[PDB]
Design a protein around this ligand. Structure first.
Ligand SMILES: Cc1ncc(COP(=O)(O)O)c(CN)c1O
Ligand SMILES: *Cc1c(COP(=O)(O)O)cnc(C)c1O
Ligand SMILES: [Ca+2]
Ligand SMILES: [Ca+2]
Ligand SMILES: [Ca+2]
Ligand SMILES: [Ca+2]
Lengths: 410, 410
């Protein structure tokens, strides 16, 4: 094995295969939606399949129709013109987008700042590039009293400051957050912005869940703050936008001098993404772009649907004594489990508490979830191992099945 | 810009956004087929599109149905049992597979041996991993007197031996060959095998055009030669097998201790490939695997269909005094361009002769093709700069259009 991938071979998701196996569990682990994608999205792929051309090579950096659509939509959001050719790169999901960014902008020996918990792929990506991850935890503040929420989690600005040195190449932002469901405030993005301009550093911003924010919160794009356009790469994904996760298409939006470096990586790695998926997606985007103001638009209906399902989950977890953190956005809910004193002690390995809890819950209660320590570097695990994450982008029937398990819990 | 991509930003194909533009001209440039894909390939995408789960995440290293099918087809070919999970890896095209091999197996300072002309991505891939490309040209032998063919090209064994040293990590082989259409012989493959065993080095075998073998030649896989299985990665593609270049799906077949390393690269880069695409591809395979002995099998029908078109091209090229090199395989044909008139000081730079010619033939004759010098290291271009590459995976209509211009050359 090449030196660049020394000890990058284990992967949380690989390890989680033998969990979801057994047919009769209700899987609330993986971010596998089992609702239907919008009908028009399925239809458009079918339509694309029967056109010859759309089954051949398209433009390497993205299908013209797609990049046209994206530049239209994000033009609206940034309130500025987005160049479809120079300021956008279409890649294999947000994974690929992340990988482009890091591969093309981050050198060996550079520091990259990561907030914990993080989407687990951040650490190995930065490591393979020969770069050093510098970790900083999110910490809880006190509750309003009545509710525990994603918004009761923040970072210490003075702590954050001290993580930037002349060795900081970049910071990785994830709002809405996986796994907390935190929707970063303007003030919080202002602190991060301030520092990248003070230290002349990049900001990579994972914003795949941009559409999934719930009432009382607003997705704010760091890249839109003063001084940030020139220094930010902002990521987005078709799986998350169209509930079509198996399409594996994402985009990186940012300034032409940073985006060029990502395109250099792409052309030297896989080059093109599939034509029919891009063709189909372009059309979906036009369908929903042309109706952004209406409740019908998928960018509106989907959070509306999920906010309901979220609230069902707060209750189901509360019902069994699990203490949930109600998320401002996204489709994951983190629950604290330490208040059940569970009948483990005797999976005997040196796993964190939460991997154990989930194993127990699968064998005994017929339900899977993801341990939050899967999203933490070593030093961080003990400070997060009583937390367990559940996914709610599920259809009614599934959440029913979940409800049956919780009601039968004692 | 990160050091690892330094001066890798020039891409040959980005540059052929030259006079590709003019709508009037017949493009025999890029390997963009305008034949229809086999109608069942299109149906299965459509069918897959309407299944909800086929639009969500699948197994990261390859859709289970697709690896099962690859396992079955290739185990017939290899005369061995191939593990679908441990010995295959589905990647975003052959491009993706190549990148997975280099990144996963090659360190800074290794030497990788490449044969010239080479498919152009081989050079910067090896460069991006900080390895040093080591070039060896293909050379002409005296012809049989009658015609010029790909089999009249080959390499000096003693010259090859001399490129092997203790710094050699791998050799890249591409049969059938792009751009000359050379089908490597058992004797030639035996030389490469010998040196790989003797020096303990990897072979990466770009076999995308494997079904495109013409009359009186046979695809043989180096991986089946004694001692090769355990040191060979053999690459395939959907775009070539099913004339569906826009699907961007390929695979690496090899031993587990090597495949595991490609998997590490994948999971830390794009992870999962498109589900609807992979589901449909598997189906397409089963259709054809079940009828191999039959002339309807796309495997048998496509090369048969294409051979006619190859000969058509040879005639057309002869008929205007371009000396065709008749290809044993794949869908590209090189013509020696040098005994024409062709004015050429109307340009006056000293970018290579074949680029000048292609610009000339585009403007003056409304026909594009690819200069062979594009596929050569700088030291090598003088020796291939009077060579031009034409693609013939085209529909009758297009070879009619081409024949109009060849009839109208003089
Ligand atoms: C020899 C060779 N290898 C690899 C590729 C890349 O193909 P894919 O689109 O499957 O990545 C091509 C493109 N025709 C090729 O000619
Ligand atoms: C699921 C997820 C991804 C992966 O995105 P794809 O577009 O499916 O490649 C990336 N980032 C975050 C924060 C995620 O939750
Ligand atoms: Ca090792
Ligand atoms: Ca502009
Ligand atoms: Ca600095
Ligand atoms: Ca050796």
């Amino acid at each position: 094995n090449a030196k660049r991938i020394e000890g990058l071979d284990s992967n949380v998701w690989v390890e989680f295969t033998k969990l979801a196996a057994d047919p009769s569990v209700v899987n609330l682990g993986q971010g596998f939606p089992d609702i239907s994608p919008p009908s028009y999205v399925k239809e458009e792929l079918s339509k694309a399949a029967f056109i010859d051309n759309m089954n051949q090579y398209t433009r390497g950096f993205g299908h013209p129709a797609l990049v046209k659509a994206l530049s239209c939509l994000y033009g609206k959001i940034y309130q500025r013109q987005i160049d479809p050719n120079e300021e956008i790169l279409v890649a294999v999901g947000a994974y690929g987008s992340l990988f482009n960014s890091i591969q093309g902008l981050v050198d060996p020996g550079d520091e990259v700042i990561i907030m914990v918990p993080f989407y687990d792929c951040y650490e190995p990506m930065v490591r393979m590039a020969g770069a050093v991850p510098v970790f900083i935890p999110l910490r809880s503040k006190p509750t309003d009293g009545m509710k525990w929420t994603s918004s009761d989690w923040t970072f210490d600005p003075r702590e954050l400051e001290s993580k930037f040195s002349s060795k900081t190449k970049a910071i990785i932002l994830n709002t809405p957050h996986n796994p907390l469901g935190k929707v970063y405030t303007r003030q919080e993005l202002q602190v991060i912005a301030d520092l990248c301009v003070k230290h002349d550093t990049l900001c990579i911003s994972d914003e795949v869940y941009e559409w999934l924010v719930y009432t009382g919160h607003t997705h704010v794009k760091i890249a839109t703050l003063p001084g940030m356009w020139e220094r930010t790469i902002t990521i987005g994904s078709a799986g998350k936008t169209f509930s079509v996760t198996g399409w594996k298409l994402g985009w990186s939006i940012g300034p032409a001098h940073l985006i060029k470096h990502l395109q250099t990586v792409q052309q030297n790695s896989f080059y093109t993404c599939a034509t029919p998926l891009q063709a189909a997606l372009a059309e979906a985007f036009w369908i929903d772009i042309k109706r952004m103001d209406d409740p019908e638009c998928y960018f509106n209906s989907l959070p509306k649907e999920l906010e309901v399902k979220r609230d069902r989950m707060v209750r189901l977890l509360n019902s069994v004594g699990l203490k949930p953190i109600v998320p401002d956005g996204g489709y994951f809910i983190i629950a604290d489990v330490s208040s059940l004193g569970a009948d483990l002690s005797d999976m005997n390995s040196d796993e964190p508490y939460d991997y154990k809890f989930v194993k127990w819950m699968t064998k005994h209660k017929k339900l899977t979830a993801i341990p939050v320590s899967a999203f933490c570097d070593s030093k961080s695990k003990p400070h997060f191992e009583k937390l367990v994450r559940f996914c709610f982008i599920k259809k009614d029937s599934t959440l029913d099945a979940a409800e049956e398990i919780f009601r039968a819990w004692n």
